């Protein structure tokens, strides 16, 4: 438990490496911002405090060194530090280039997604845009309460535009 | 009659190299004459002045914004970030050309922007990038002058240049104050200009300039 | 009454999903499509003050 | 070490307007009264005490007071003990005035 | 759907409309590009039967000096007080929609059902009588 001296071996849901593997630490964090009481004059009008919830563990590829001129994160292997349910797993990456197995290390750029299950890799020409990212959401959860709000109308079988 | 009219300034302070307030007081005017300059010399102001920045830059070996280089603190977007706000004074017309070919693991100032005779730097504390490995930099740049409420379109895609596209303000903001007084007989006014300026024009040179520009589009009316 | 429709029509904000775009933007399209990055970059997307 | 020196304290620009419609407004005497009244602990005790003060610079210099408003004249002597210039009276001027009367809004 | 717009259609067009008013106006504005000022300015000056075309504009700059702004300004002289009244819809800053300024009589009549069943010359009065 955090700051305690009580210890405890972890949950293993997955085969974990049995060798020395220089790999990177990542977090998954929230940055919450509640607003506290304000009590006397000059008290703190807001708060903050991380909320890491995930820590990835990505190895390098072949262990290279940090400042070596060919400096690229194995993406194959990452192994994920839960924090609700104390346990390591191993990630389950996907990889859409089409060249497969024989490519270019120097770049596939990598994609999370929710709540850090969904893991792809993708050549890094086709990044997306922050506003598109953002913007794909928005389309797509206010297309759902739209048409749910509208399921309710006499008239919402025979309809159309969206 | 008596006192014609005339204009004096009273507050003009420098903050630092890149602000410039100034206050002025214009002469007895008539009811409602007050409201009209102020409103004018406002529209005038806030976009009439030529503006010379940078408006490209062409980054060898990079091929997209979010791949910053090694030995650079600052990402591609972030040299870009930093080369928008310089501030450059000039009398240009059209374009120019400029490069920055330096190589050592140190700071970069607006000293190392290239520069033809009539573009000048105003501050020399700006900071552009900051080197850390032994790396060869070049960024060929693009200086550019239009007006106040200039629409340009992206272009030139072939070389890999990425638009910088930018504001063109020598002015940060204007404020246009009234008063008046009555001798019992005359309702005697009185205007205040507030003019902030970016430091490639002294905010007493936007008063001529911002008036002349004005002067300059409404006189074809006597043609 | 006026002072808070002000402010209320002040921080309003964009317009958020659907009533901004009219088609929906996975729309696998306009991505200057080749096998290299070599094209015509527009990228409007929003400015960056 | 603490990375945020000089981000908290960036001077924020454009404050020249507002640093006037304070002045005319009576801000700088409403800011002033609580900064006097901030360790004091009953407030009728303070306003009597500034009453009888002023009563007193009345008396004392008669035929002066009129203008003045001699409790702003006590108000301004005390406020003036510490730093903050405050000028005498809080008495206002009319820096650009070739008639009589401003029409006040 | 079908023939009429139904409750549901109506009430989902409520919410999208500024995105087909703007697709509307980008495509009007569009059009000014290949057709140019002297055409697109000329189905609100009627009586004039030029050739309202940047093809013989040139022709004509070639014949006399007058450039694509004499031309354009010489059409602009014969607009009538109304006709100009109704082309100012295409103001800068007034952008009416291109689809609402022209509607068919039938299709405006429409958003308030038609004429009034009780006739509308019971109420109309004269200024001048007593």
């Known amino acids: ?162 | 009659s008596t006192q014609t009219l005339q204009w004096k300034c009273v507050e003009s302070r420098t903050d630092s190299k890149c602000l410039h307030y100034g206050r002025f007081i214009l002469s007895p005017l008539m009811k409602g004459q007050a409201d009209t300059i102020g409103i004018a010399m406002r529209r005038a102001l806030l976009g009439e002045i030529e503006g010379t920045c940078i408006t490209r830059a062409k980054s060898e070996k990079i091929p997209h914004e979010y791949s910053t280089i090694l030995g650079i603190q600052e990402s591609v977007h972030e040299i870009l970030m930093n080369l928008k706000e310089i501030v450059l004074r000039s009398n240009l017309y059209g374009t120019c050309e400029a490069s920055i070919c330096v190589r050592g693991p140190r700071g970069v100032t607006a000293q190392d922007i290239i520069l033809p005779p009539y573009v000048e730097i105003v501050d020399n504390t700006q900071h552009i990038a900051s080197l850390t490995e032994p790396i060869d930099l070049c960024i060929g740049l693009q200086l550019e002058r239009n007006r106040g409420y200039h629409i340009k379109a992206p272009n030139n895609f072939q070389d890999g240049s990425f638009p910088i596209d930018a504001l063109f303000m020598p002015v940060r903001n204007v404020n246009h104050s009234i008063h008046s007084y009555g001798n019992g007989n005359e309702k005697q006014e009185i205007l205040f200009l507030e003019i902030w300026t970016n430091g490639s024009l002294t905010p007493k040179e936007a008063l001529y300039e911002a008036s002349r520009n004005l002067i300059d589009l409404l006189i074809p009316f006597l043609h | 009454q006026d002072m808070l429709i002000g402010l209320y029509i002040l921080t309003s904000g964009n317009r958020r999903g659907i009533c901004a775009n009219r088609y929906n933007p996975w729309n696998h399209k306009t991505y200057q499509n080749e096998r290299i990055d070599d094209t015509n970059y527009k990228s409007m997307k929003e400015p960056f003050f | ?105 | 759907y079908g023939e009429q717009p139904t409750l549901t259609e109506t009430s989902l067009y409520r919410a999208r409309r500024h995105l087909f008013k703007e697709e509307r106006l980008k495509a009007e504005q569009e059009r000014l590009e290949k057709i140019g000022p002297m055409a697109f300015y000329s189905e609100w000056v009627k009586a004039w039967k030029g050739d309202t075309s940047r093809e013989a504009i040139q022709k004509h700059f070639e014949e006399t000096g007058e450039d694509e702004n004499t031309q354009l300004i010489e059409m602009l002289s014969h607009q009538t007080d109304r006709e100009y009244r109704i082309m100012m819809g295409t103001d800068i800053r007034i952008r009416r929609d291109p689809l609402a300024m022209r509607m068919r009589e039938d299709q405006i009549k429409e958003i308030w059902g038609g004429d009034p069943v009780y006739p509308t010359i019971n109420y109309i009065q004269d200024p001048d009588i007593v």
């Open chain 4, 1 to 105: 070490k603490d990375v945020f020196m000089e981000a908290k304290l960036e001077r924020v620009p454009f404050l020249e307007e507002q640093m006037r419609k304070v002045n005319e407004g009576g801000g700088v005497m409403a800011g002033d009264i609580d900064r006097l009244m901030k360790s004091e602990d009953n407030r009728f005790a303070f306003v009597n005490e500034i009453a009888a003060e002023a009563t007193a610079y009345v008396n004392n210099n008669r035929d002066e007071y009129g203008h003045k408003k001699a409790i702003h004249h006590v108000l301004s002597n005390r406020m003036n003990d510490a730093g903050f210039a405050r000028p005498e009276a809080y008495l206002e001027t009319e820096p650009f005035s070739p008639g009589p009367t401003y029409l006040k809004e």
């Open chain 1, 1 to 162: 438990p955090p700051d305690t001296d009580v210890y405890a071996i972890p949950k293993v849901l997955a085969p974990m490496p049995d060798k020395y593997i220089r790999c990177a630490k990542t977090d998954y964090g929230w940055y919450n911002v509640t607003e506290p009481p304000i009590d006397a004059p000059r008290d703190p009008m807001y708060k903050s405090e991380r909320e890491v919830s995930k820590v990835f563990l990505t190895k390098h590829y072949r262990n290279r060194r940090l400042n070596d001129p060919e400096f690229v994160l194995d993406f194959e292997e990452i192994y994920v530090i839960d924090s609700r349910t104390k346990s390591v797993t191993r990630a389950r990456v996907l990889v859409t280039v089409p060249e497969g197995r024989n490519r270019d290390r120097k770049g596939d750029l990598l994609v999370i997604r929710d709540n850090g299950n969904s893991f792809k890799i993708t050549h890094a020409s086709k990044r997306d845009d922050p506003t598109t990212v953002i913007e794909r959401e928005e389309w797509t959860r206010t297309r759902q309460d739209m048409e749910r709000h509208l399921r309710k109308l006499r008239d919402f079988s025979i309809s159309n535009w969206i």
